[PDB]
Design a protein around this ligand. Structure first.
Ligand code: HEM
Ligand code: HEM
Ligand code: NA
Ligand code: NA
Lengths: 713, 713
């Protein structure tokens, strides 16, 4: 059946804004996962998980009699799709159970692992999500095998359909670099927002870059991909060596024995895949990646054997039974146990990427420190495992249950506790009047609050206006934020704040974070008044101000908007059309198509454009909250053409006279071009819609101002 | 970006069940179109439309100074996508303004027609939908040119994204028959559910079949395609000759002058397309189809000149300026006016498909009668035009406004008025107890009510339990409905009804339509009771019984279910996998994926299968309402394999012993195979889900029972 995507493959896809509707969700519309989880008997779940570890099923027998290694890998793949670039991927939505990730080649046989958890999921029902279960099982596996974890938070709500993520443009699974859709260019530069080296891999190729077994070049890829998942050198060595303290790989025979991945298998396979014709197809005959490596002399117990073996032997290049490159210890005795046959033992083996930990010079120093000080290694790995499994969860207010660590970590972008009475409605009125009396304009007030709040992304729940981090490095210097104008607005706001706070009793005070947001609300109210409408914009206090020492400047850099269509901003020229970038940003902000439409039309007229650009400012009453953007955009009395100087700027001219009426970008004009967007614009550009526009604008404005308000959730 | 559809192109698509969410809709959740329309000043809209007809815009100058012809074609293409096989397409959702229909080659330049209506749409806002406006404008065009229409009903609510319709499998616009994706097989047999001869055409090719200009052969395609839009010979002749009484075609120069259709055009074109480099690109130089035919001597006035010309001249095969085949009157004078130059005149011209009306022998008799009796032609055309434009609107209860015709037409599947007091809640409880005391089983009661209510399709709002047409030809003889079992149930229910109705005072009585549904409600309540649960199933009386004389048997044939996954039924063996047919049925019933899942699992254990098949009946307590279907389907202790006899039937065996536990079809087992469906099955198969399962089953049962209840809307 031919589809619109077939006929017009480069037209914008708005269905990504309408996912995760109440239609696809089986739970009622008021189902609150947090409340279900809070009543879960978590200790009972953990006892069941401990039992499962050694309860081998005949359809996928447990290596060494213990599924721990398989479940740790399962949990690390669950978390390991995360990209700091957009916040997308990670464990936080349980997306491993859906396409495509359920069938990625790197997730081979993790279908079996998830199926082993069905009876526990079934027993506890809606009170523990799959997303939470996958991570808890990884924690229990570690604990079962003698490693004490740093803690665990629940609260990852399950999702019910595939997340829309750009994973790459290759049309062949695992395609090597330099093809027609290469994710690499130049000096091995991986394209943003990707965080893996080949389509269908978590991070890197275990044989080495594009299959070439050089540990030093492999180290480069490990470092690049791990940095793109938010992990530095210490955390990376701790994670890889910690993980490979346990379990084994599977490559007992040739890969051509292995059949269709789950999404391609027959209906009789009942959701499972990679069925293998090699001998029994499982256990001692398992084939998962094709590598055949067992790292330690006690694969089911925490030990310090990974680094003893790494440093204690010299390594020779060899091949697994499936033909994959891997390394064997020169001259070693057969000291590694077999996973099924008590009378067999094996020499120590390593992956190319394991040897990176020794042969990359920066990794070697950390590996050596961990080898000499195994207590440091233990603590680093525990902390890293917590980070890995919680990095996409959001602020600490979302963390549920009795195992949440009390230590506050820099990567969590922590927000101080509020310790004082908050402002009330009479105080908010007084502060709004002070803000309007100072001379700050509608444009300044709206632009600053937008700049503060629109850093939020729902993908990893980072960003937003809580914290007042717009006043700190690096946000205060971002070009999209207009540093000189920002400084002057913040200075005026801080004077108002200081005066209000100095006048209070009883410890009451207002944060700068709250005041920025409140000042934006005063500007929207003033804009409505300018248009002859009486509007009150809702405001919820309770934001606190974070310090510079609580704000990791390099981790903050991914939140920098390089494209923000809501302010008609593009930092440079990109291969992706700007309207595709707008929809991407709308998705991160959790906006539907109607919300994105209303919001953008209103911001244009309020003067939220960066640099005071006139592009899309289709009104003769700037700083008044009207639907002018829509009524003018849709006026057939105007004809639009790309400019000579710039194909991405358009001039709109009177059809009868040729006189210039307006200019716009692709972000402005897409609302008059895309047939679903123009349908939405027509609603707001109708003669009966001025009041609807104002009230829908105030709603969406308020929504954006509260995106990060998990303390009120 | 590579997507799941790319990787797994034959996996089932559930997103078709989750369109039309509250996320995509710009109107509030409480917006009621009918309430907005009922306050529209319809007479004022029609006066504005009447003015528009002769107010030419210079960006698309009006032929003959009158847009009438253009708007009639606009309104005919809006309705002309309709297929009786599934009820999909038609005018009832305004889908012409979305992809793909906005850019079909047959809809070329209707973009300009819609843009001409923006100022009126803008003036009246949400009180008149695009969908209604399209049709109204074609009525006003006709009226302005002297034709008295049969009437008009408003009430077509606007939609906000493209409908998912199978329009064919060709990958090239207008591909000629016999390609790799041919819609034709055998002796020119058009595949169901298609109703057009080439991808991107409304009905037929105006040159002739695959471009061959033979009016006799073209007649065959006209007859076949019109029949597939539910029009007979009389109606077809009336429509084509009536339409071609007005206006002209456009082919002033070569088609290679014409640029990209709207979905492919640049952003600057602002939703318009087919921009032409031929001379001025418009007006006298317009190119739309490439044909250049003007049918009558007064193209802006109703007349009987189409048939005077058709029968008064002999016709010669010729070519337009773009090279298309067309016909010119042999030896004629220049009597047809030019569309822009008052000093120029032209000979009569015709399409191949016009001459079909004279050269097909059955058409010729009707055309002759209409020629000799133009009052009959006018009446036929008026009636047909109403039918064409209202055929997908549904029951007469949905018809709004002051111009609704009072005559009740057989194609409307009319339902008589209710003239008596309805049963109350106490009466409903007494009838449910009498039904259960009769000895009718849960299975019989559920199966009968399902068979009555599940003929509904939301595509054209035909079918449903209102009317009690299950007791009439042809529904009573459909194989899916189990004619002998149905007859015995209906006999028992009619005895109950007769006894109840004979006992009442005050004229109160119960229809058989209401009692079939209520009997099904009693069956579901009893099934819940069998499982240890007391529930009330909601029931809304007010259905009435239609007669056989009010039921067009041939028109009812398309409602026959030949695939009903909810009863595990397939009338024969099809190209399309059964699971795809299930999702198609779910879509027609307006069900979400969660609704379809609950509903199916419940029907299986209630005994709803045709023929008492045990396939998918995964319970040891049939006729009790439990979640057994899901608990047993998801049990990994069972292994499933296709049977030797039949690849589409599967045996479920104990994994350890080999014992045969169950059998199922593809429809049953897809719920354990598809990753999004199995996630839903898991919810209902959880240990905490029994109450949720029953609640959700009763809600969807009730939803189905009320699909056609537009009298309560
Ligand atoms: C450079 C990064 C890494 C590479 C290339 C990589 C590669 C692999 C490969 C190829 C397998 C074998 C899969 C099979 O054939 O069954 C595997 C297994 C595993 N990895 Fe990693 N690994 C990486 C990092 C991680 C990290 C961060 C963790 C966890 C903290 C982890 C924990 C595991 C465990 C536990 C197994 C054993 C699975 C079993 O016993 O069934 N690895 N790794
Ligand atoms: C076999 C069925 C039909 C065929 C093949 C057909 C074909 C066409 C073609 C090729 C055009 C010229 C489009 C252009 O170049 O501008 C057209 C114009 C038109 N058709 Fe049809 N037609 C059919 C049925 C109908 C029906 C059922 C109606 C309405 C009752 C309709 C009303 C019109 C009108 C009013 C125009 C003139 C548009 C204008 O003035 O701009 N036709 N027809
Ligand atoms: Na994420
Ligand atoms: Na329809």
């Amino acid at each position: 059946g031919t589809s619109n995507r077939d006929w017009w493959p480069n037209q914008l896809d708005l269905s990504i804004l309408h996912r995760h509707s109440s239609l696809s969700d089986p739970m009622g519309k008021d189902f609150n996962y947090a409340q279900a989880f809070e009543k879960l008997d978590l200790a009972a779940v953990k006892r069941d998980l401990h039992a499962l570890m050694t309860t081998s099923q005949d359809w996928w027998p447990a290596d060494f009699g213990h599924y721990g290694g398989l479940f740790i890998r399962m949990a690390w793949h669950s978390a390991g799709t995360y990209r700091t670039a957009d916040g997308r991927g990670g464990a936080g939505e349980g997306q491993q159970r859906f396409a495509p990730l359920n069938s990625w080649p790197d997730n081979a046989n993790l279908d079996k692992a998830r199926r082993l958890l069905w009876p526990i999921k079934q027993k506890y029902g809606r009170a523990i999500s799959w997303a939470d279960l996958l991570i808890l099982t990884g924690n229990v596996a570690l604990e079962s095998m003698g490693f004490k974890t740093f803690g665990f938070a629940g609260g990852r709500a399950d999702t019910w359909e595939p997340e829309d993520v750009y994973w790459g443009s290759e049309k062949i699974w695992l395609e090597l670099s330099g093809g027609p859709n290469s994710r690499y260019s130049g000096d091995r530069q991986l394209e943003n927002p990707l965080a893996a080296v080949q389509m269908g891999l978590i991070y890197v190729n275990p044989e080495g870059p594009d299959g070439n077994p050089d540990p030093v070049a492999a180290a480069r890829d490990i470092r690049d991909t791990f940095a793109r998942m938010a992990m530095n050198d210490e955390e990376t060595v701790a994670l890889i060596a910690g993980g490979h303290t346990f379990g084994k790989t599977h490559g007992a025979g040739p890969a051509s024995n292995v059949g269709a991945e789950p999404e391609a298998a027959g209906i009789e396979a009942q959701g499972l895949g990679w069925k293998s014709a090699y001998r029994t197809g499982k256990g001692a005959d398992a084939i998962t990646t094709g590598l055949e490596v067992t790292w330690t002399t006690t694969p089911t117990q925490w030990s310090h054997n990974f680094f003893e073996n790494l440093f204690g032997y010299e390594w020779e290049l060899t091949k697994s039974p499936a033909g994959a490159h891997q390394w064997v210890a020169k001259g070693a005795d057969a000291v590694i146990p077999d996973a099924f046959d008590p009378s067999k033992k094996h020499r120590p083996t390593m992956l190319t990427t394991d040897l990176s930990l020794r042969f990359d010079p920066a990794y070697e120093k950390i590996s050596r420190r961990f080898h000499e000080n195994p207590e440091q290694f233990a603590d680093a790995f525990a902390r890293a495992w917590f980070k890995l499994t919680h990095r996409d969860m959001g602020p600490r207010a979302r963390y549920l249950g009795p195992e949440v660590p009390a230590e506050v970590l820099l990567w969590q972008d922590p927000i101080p506790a509020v310790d004082h009475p908050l402002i009330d409605a009479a105080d908010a009125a007084e502060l709004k009047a002070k803000v309007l009396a100072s001379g700050l304009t509608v444009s300044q007030l709206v632009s600053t609050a937008w700049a503060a709040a629109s850093t939020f992304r729902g993908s990893d729940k980072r960003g937003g206006a809580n914290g007042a981090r717009i006043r700190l490095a690096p946000q205060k210097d971002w070009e999209a934020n207009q540093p000189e104008q920002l400084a002057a607005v913040l200075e005026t706001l801080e004077a108002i704040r200081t005066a209000f706070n100095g006048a209070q009793r009883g410890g009451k005070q207002v944060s700068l974070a709250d005041l920025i947001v409140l000042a934006g609300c005063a500007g929207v109210e003033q804009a409505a008044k300018n248009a002859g409408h009486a509007v009150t914009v809702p405001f919820a206090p309770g934001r606190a101000d974070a310090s510079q020492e609580q704000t990791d400047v390099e981790s903050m850099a991914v939140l920098e908007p390089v494209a923000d269509g809501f302010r008609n901003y593009l930092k440079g020229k990109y291969r992706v059309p700007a309207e595709v970038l707008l929809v991407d940003k709308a998705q991160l902000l959790t906006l539907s198509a109607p919300e994105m439409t209303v919001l953008l039309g209103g911001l244009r007229v309020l003067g939220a454009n960066v640099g005071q650009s006139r592009h899309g400012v289709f009104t003769a009453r700037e700083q008044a909250l009207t639907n002018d953007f829509f009524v003018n955009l849709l006026d057939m009395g105007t004809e639009w053409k790309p400019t000579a100087a710039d194909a991405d700027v358009f001039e709109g001219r009177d059809r009868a006279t040729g006189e210039l009426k307006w200019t716009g970008t692709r972000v402005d004009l897409v609302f008059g071009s895309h047939s679903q967007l123009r349908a939405l614009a027509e609603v707001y550009g109708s003669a009966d819609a001025q009041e609807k526009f104002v009230r829908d604008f105030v709603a969406v404005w308020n929504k954006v101002m509260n995106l990060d308000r998990f303390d009120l959730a």
